[PDB]
Amino acid sequence: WGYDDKNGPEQWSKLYPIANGNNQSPVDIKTSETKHDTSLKPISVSYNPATAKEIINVGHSFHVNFEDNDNRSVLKGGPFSDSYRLFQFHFHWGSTNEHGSEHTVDGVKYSAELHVAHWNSAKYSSLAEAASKADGLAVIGVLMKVGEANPKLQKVLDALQAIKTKGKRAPFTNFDPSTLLPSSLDFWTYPGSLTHPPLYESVTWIICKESISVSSEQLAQFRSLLSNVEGDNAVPMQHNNRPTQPLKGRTVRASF
Numbered sequence: 001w002g003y004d005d006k007n008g009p010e011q012w013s014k015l016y017p018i019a020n021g022n023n024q025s026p027v028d029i030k031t032s033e034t035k036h037d038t039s040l041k042p043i044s045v046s047y048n049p050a051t052a053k054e055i056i057n058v059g060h061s062f063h064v065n066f067e068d069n070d071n072r073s074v075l076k077g078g079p080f081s082d083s084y085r086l087f088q089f090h091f092h093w094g095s096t097n098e099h100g101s102e103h104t105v106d107g108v109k110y111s112a113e114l115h116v117a118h119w120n121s122a123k124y125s126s127l128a129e130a131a132s133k134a135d136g137l138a139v140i141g142v143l144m145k146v147g148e149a150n151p152k153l154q155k156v157l158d159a160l161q162a163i164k165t166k167g168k169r170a171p172f173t174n175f176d177p178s179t180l181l182p183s184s185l186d187f188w189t190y191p192g193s194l195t196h197p198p199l200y201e202s203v204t205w206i207i208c209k210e211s212i213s214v215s216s217e218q219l220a221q222f223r224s225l226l227s228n229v230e231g232d233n234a235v236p237m238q239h240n241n242r243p244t245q246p247l248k249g250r251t252v253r254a255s256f
């Protein structure tokens with residue numbers, strides 16, 4: 001699977017029938033149809049920069065993974081009773097500035113989107129166990145609006161020249177990804193899925209109302225990562241965003 005004409009989002013259902021399921025992500029958040037939910041607590045993140053582990057070129061994207069053997073780095077609050085353990089963050093982006101985010105807000109497409117993913121360590125003993133459970137994953141998404149260069153992206157951007165081609169990986173340490181979150185954590189929440197195979201309907205989404213910035217030249221660094229292995233002809237990672245999927249009657253809730 002990928003994001004090409006032949007292996008891309010509109011082909012995924014051939015191998016992953018859940019792609020046409022009832023809790024698929026991302027979605028368009030229509031703000032006139034969201035229902036403010038007064039029981040939603042504030043989102044609380046508390047991450048230890050010592051859990052940051054490694055950065056990896058996974059061919060369609062790159063991931064920054066964290067040690068997840070204990071509760072040094074956790075998400076609590078929001079719609080959750082359980083505490084969720086941080087395991088990764090990564091980005092999605094598009095061919096040009098005009099699209100690139102996965103979620104849209106009232107039809108508006110942003111330039112990129114940051115996903116900070118976590119697994120339910122109150123209920124499950126590993127990411128592998130949690131990843132297929134209805135309540136197993138909690139992902140914060142933050143919409144990225146093209147404009148001013150974002151300095152908090154810096155350590156991440158500087159690391160990519162060491163993982164230029166598919167399968168390359170490098171240590172990436174002492175990094176607290178709450179520094180990338182917008183100053184207000186007001187959010188939307190809905191029940192959905194991983195946005196690429198295997199597309200498990202295991203994700204509680206937490207979408208921030210406030211965007212963060214990214215420059216047109218920062219976006220170019222993402223798109224200059226390569227999806228081919230070292231020594232093959234260079235294939236730029238131009239985009240990795242899935243189109244928005246039908247709500248199928250789920251309700252998007254607002255904390256604000």
Ligand SMILES: NC(N)=NC1=[SH]CC(CSCC/C(N)=N/S(N)(=O)=O)=N1
Pocket residue numbers: 115117127128129131139193194195196197198
């Ligand atoms: N199979 C297995 N044992 N563990 C798995 S399968 C996918 C997975 C999460 S990695 C995160 C990749 C992703 N698509 N998340 S997103 N874009 O935030 O919806 N862990």
Ligand SMILES: [Zn+2]
Pocket residue numbers: 090091092115195
């Ligand atoms: Zn993602």
